[PDB]
């Protein structure tokens, strides 16, 4: 099903891209959890405010292949994130937020670890995490 989709570049998930946040470790279930509650408390603290805040959740569609993760805005169809899978450290669902999924990755210019959170609309977080694991696998295996 999903697994056959990732290799064939056909695998997609409807999502809400919450945004990125610096995190202090490359892997970790609580590092993720933290990053999710930060973004959810950044969006929430700024509620009611009328204007552009730095950090507003964005409805988009997430594509998962062996080459990278891409999130294309459903609204503008602009490629918002084109992340190569080889500079990806970790990914995970959220123990206390069932719709949540995130992945950590290294950014070599800033020389830092960066979490990237999403909230799935029609699916559970673990289906997504699994899909990205299939990506991880496909990558690791021919190399």
């Amino acid at each position: 099903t999903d697994e056959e989709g990732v290799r064939t570049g056909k695998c997609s998930f409807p999502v809400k891209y919450l945004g990125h946040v610096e995190v202090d470790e490359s892997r970790g279930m609580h590092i993720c959890e933290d990053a999710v509650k930060r973004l959810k408390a950044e969006r929430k603290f700024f509620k009611g405010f009328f204007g552009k805040t730095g950090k507003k959740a964005v409805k988009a569609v997430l594509w998962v292949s062996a080459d990278g993760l891409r999130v294309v805005d459903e609204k503008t169809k602009d490629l918002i994130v084109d992340q190569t899978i080889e500079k990806v450290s970790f990914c995970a669902p959220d123990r206390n937020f069932d719709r949540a999924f995130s992945y950590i990755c290294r950014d070599g210019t800033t020389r830092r670890w960066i979490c990237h959170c999403f909230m799935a609309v029609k699916d559970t977080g673990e289906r997504l995490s699994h899909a990205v694991g299939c990506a991880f696998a496909a990558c690791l295996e021919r190399k």
């Binding site: 490359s26 892997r27 080889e86 500079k87 990806v88 970790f90 990914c91 990755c105 290294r106 991880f136």
Partner: peptide, 7 residues
Amino acid sequence: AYIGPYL
């Protein structure tokens, strides 16, 4: 989970 190919 899972772990990634970086590192």
